[PDB]
Amino acid sequence: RGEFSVCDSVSVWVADKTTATDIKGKEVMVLGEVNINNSVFKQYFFETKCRDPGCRGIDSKHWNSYCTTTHTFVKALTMDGKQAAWRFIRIDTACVCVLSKKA
């Protein structure tokens, strides 16, 4: 169907991620590969974000609007310099439109 997203986005598989921020606001290293019960996986992250810069289809003469990137949190083997551990880390997941009254 000829359906359009209000904000345009880009999705990509990320396999070379080296750093991230966890759910507690801490910066961490993200490992390239993980050992889970004697299986070896690469850490891939499916990331979606706005393209470089208002929103589309907006009733403009009553609203200001911009496109912004929102996130999810995804478990990952990480290292903070003190402890190697699985932690939930912030990942870009969508491009969404935000409104404000024009005045």
Residue numbers at the binding site for a second copy (CB under 8 A): 1-7, 35-37, 39, 41, 44, 46-48, 55-60, 62-63, 65, 70, 72-75, 86, 88, 91, 93-101
Which is nearer to Cl ion, 30 or 55 (by Cβ)? 55
**Bridge partners, residue 80, by sequence:** none
Q: Does 58 bind Cl ion (CB under 5 A)?
A: no
Which is nearer to Cl ion, 6 or 31 (by Cβ)? 6
Q: Is the distance from CB of 100 to CB of 65 less than 8 angstroms?
A: yes
Q: Does 29 bind Cl ion (CB under 5 A)?
A: no
Q: Does 96 bind Cl ion (CB under 5 A)?
A: yes
Contacts of 81 (CB under 8 A, 6+ apart): 29
User: Tokens 């019960």 correspond to what residue?
Assistant: 37
Tokens of 35: 């050992």
Which DSSP symbol is given to 77? Answer: E
Site residues, Cl ion (CB under 5 A): 6, 96-97
